[PDB]
Point group: C3
Chain length 239, copies 3
């Protein structure tokens, strides 16, 4: 029993994302034209994409019930699948990467390559959750998704940092890269521990809360820190 546990994890972020959007409009309204202003735009779009994700889940548009396959801890049982989360990450995670790439001033060759890997990660993660014929294919898609994640992590952890040191944004970039790497690693852990994976935690409402908490930090806190710094150091960024 937990329709309320599940629904509260969703409404709470519709409220938080909405508040973040207002706060960010306030914070960036006077930012100078150019690169600084572009990052402000990305910072606004991260919570807007997040609200779309939560509305898809609350409305029922992007949620369905799926039956787990033989071998799964819940084999032959119906599980609620919030596939709308996995689908929407294909738009919000590239926006986070866009914000970070604009900040580090990376060449779009690198930005395009990282967003491509990131989309591969999200598409294969969705496939992992939607696959029901055999347990093997669910984990095979999860593994491929991890492989795409490594490509993204390698870029944060290395190439992109090179670009930041040269744009005069190494310090803020180091803070945001570490926060991103740490929080992003939490999504596949939640997936593997919850109903979709090993089912060590069998509550979909609990797992939904785990993702909602990760979102608050990976998206809203992330974006506030980034936007506050850019507003306070706009000459460096336009430069």
């Amino acid at each position: 029993r937990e329709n309320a546990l599940l629904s509260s994890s969703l409404w709470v972020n519709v409220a938080l994302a909405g508040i973040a959007i207002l706060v960010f409009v306030y914070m960036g309204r006077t930012i100078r034209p150019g690169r600084p202003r572009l990052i402000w735009g990305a910072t606004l779009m991260i919570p807007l994409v997040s609200i779309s994700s939560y509305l898809g889940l609350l409305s029922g548009l992007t949620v369905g019930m799926i039956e787990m396959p033989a071998g799964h801890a819940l084999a032959g049982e119906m599980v609620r699948s919030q596939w709308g989360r996995y689908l929407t990450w294909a738009l919000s995670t590239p926006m986070i990467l866009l914000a970070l790439g604009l900040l580090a001033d990376v060449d779009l060759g690198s930005l395009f390559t990282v967003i491509a890997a990131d989309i591969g990660m999200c598409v294969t993660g969705l496939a992992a959750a939607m696959t029901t014929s055999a347990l093997l294919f669910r984990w095979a898609f999860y593994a491929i998704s991890c492989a795409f994640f490594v490509v993204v992590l390698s870029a944060l952890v290395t190439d992109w940092a090179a670009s930041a040191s040269s744009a005069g944004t190494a310090e803020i970039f180091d803070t945001l890269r570490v926060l991103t790497v740490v929080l992003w690693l939490g999504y596949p852990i939640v997936w593997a521990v919850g109903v979709e994976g090993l089912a060590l935690v069998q509550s979909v409402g609990a797992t939904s809360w785990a993702y909602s908490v990760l979102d608050v930090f990976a998206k809203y806190v992330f974006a506030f820190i980034l936007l506050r710094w850019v507003a306070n150091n706009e000459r460096t960024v336009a430069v």
Copy 2:
């Protein structure tokens, strides 16, 4: 009664888009290599994406019947939903923005950010039309879509214009930006007045004609004006 009213609004643009494509091949065949030639390519792709959209609708591939929720003027009634229009805009509107960004010579940081917002606009607009559980979620998605539209409009209306003045294309860019802003504003008005929204107009054939007319100007006339100017001023653009 209006299978004919609806079907004619679709075939008419398959014919017009097809004619535009032939005219554009004729107009741009001799354009010099580089930036001018890239814009010619985008100008060809706008009507090609448009024809795909109309074929999805005419074939039935991207059309379904949906039932309106409690509170809607047509609550508990089946309505034809041309969701293929909303879906295909996710590919054609970025092409229009690409053509305008190549023209204004914007940095791809800005172009990527604007196309990202534009895709958010189109995806949330589709969600608005496909949502059926509650009337509230339909309008919530419509509002978020409007928010993404504002980000795109802000770019036309400001940042991009800066880039154009510096590329030597301010005049043609001012003409095309104004035409785009005006015509693009007509799509959410049609959506809100027609069956999907307030249903002040309850004919799906009429609303389909409203969109078809907007397409002729937003896509075909838009592209002809752009292509004619680039063919006539290719030195400025390659420069």
Copy 3:
């Protein structure tokens, strides 16, 4: 009878793609930071996207049975449709184009325009295979797809080559462009000769083998040649 013929064409490439990935990690581990390293990343992602495609097909996630329309050689018969192939090309073909564009050092204006056309090609090809109301619309989508393909071919065949000569990569680019043009032309031929098109070949297992063979060369051999050359000429590429 041929569940085995069909399934072997899929498992064989899961194995080959997996081997390619290991070989490429080995080959590119020491490549210098920058452009060379980005191409290595794309070279890794081509086979990773390919494995996702084959897992979607083997699991049943991206396969369905469709009934052919009046006038088709198999009118009123159920045909297995591997639509997951067509869908996944929307991610793998842009990666191939990305690798080639990084190699030729093209401006992202051109790269974005070519990937846009390429996605149009893949989306309309999928529509061609998924359309079932009338035979006419299947071929109309196939023709539009061909039109988008011409835009991509024009870029390989011309604009991109200009960029390569200027990056010091003309020779390797000429080899890879020719291999790409030739192998890519084989996909629409297979589509038109097999069950989806004219049905001159009515075995879905045979047609699946035709695509699998094209994939080995268009993706794995392609990527090995590209990666071997970049590892051996990294100074030219970083330069």
